[PDB]
Amino acid sequence: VNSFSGYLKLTDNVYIKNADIVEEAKKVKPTVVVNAANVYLKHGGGVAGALNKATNNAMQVESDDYIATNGPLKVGGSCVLSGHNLAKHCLHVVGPNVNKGEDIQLLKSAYENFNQHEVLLAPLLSAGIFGADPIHSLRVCVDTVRTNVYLAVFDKNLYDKLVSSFL
Ligand SMILES: CC(C)[C@H](Nc1ncnc2[nH]c(-c3ccc(S(=O)(=O)NCCO)cc3)cc12)c1ccc2c(c1)S(=O)(=O)CCC2
């Protein structure tokens, strides 16, 4: 259960590893995997596309049914759906996409959703092509998340810059 390996503990509740979140989910089958979602839960590329491809599109079929019945999420919001073969549950969280003018204050609301789950495997919210400064996203995670979060960052260069900034 939640057999995370090779993480570096940064704080009492934040751990980090240079790894593909999809490979970590396949190995660990955690209780919760976090998806870096958008408000219509369309998993077209990046982390969301990779997690969806690893479920062979089951995540996308389920997300479409959630959207049809409940409507879109808001930026900073989340929903809990099945984790299929990757985890017991998938927590779809929408961080702001600064490359599109969404406010950075919503990154704190996005990480606050992690607090409803004791243990989570997660990506660094709003980083990559969402345009937020990735070291700033790690500072918001550290100051906002109180439950146990295991961050998988699939880039050794960025992992080293995050760990150098933190230590
Ligand atoms: C900052 C960056 C290093 C980080 N990336 C990632 N972090 C952690 N696990 C990751 N897996 C992949 C991946 C991609 C594609 C594929 S593939 O389907 O092309 N190849 C399949 C081979 O089995 C296979 C894994 C990316 C990745 C990240 C963190 C946050 C965000 C992004 C990206 S974003 O997707 O640009 C926008 C949403 C916010």
UniProtKB/Swiss-Prot annotation:
Oligomeric form and interacting partners: May form homohexamers. Interacts with N protein.
Covered residues, full protein: 1025 to 1191 of 7096
Protein's recorded name: Papain-like protease nsp3
Function: Responsible for the cleavages located at the N-terminus of the replicase polyprotein. Participates together with nsp4 in the assembly of virally-induced cytoplasmic double-membrane vesicles necessary for viral replication. Antagonizes innate immune induction of type I interferon by blocking the phosphorylation, dimerization and subsequent nuclear translocation of host IRF3. Also prevents host NF-kappa-B signaling. In addition, PL-PRO possesses a deubiquitinating/deISGylating activity and processes both 'Lys-48'- and 'Lys-63'-linked polyubiquitin chains from cellular substrates.
Activity control note: Inhibited in vitro by GRL-0617.
Residue span, Macro domain: 1-167
Catalytic activity line of the entry: Thiol-dependent hydrolysis of ester, thioester, amide, peptide and isopeptide bonds formed by the C-terminal Gly of ubiquitin (a 76-residue protein attached to proteins as an intracellular targeting signal)
Subcellular location(s) per record: Host endoplasmic reticulum membrane
Domain of life per record: Viruses
Membrane topology: Multi-pass membrane protein
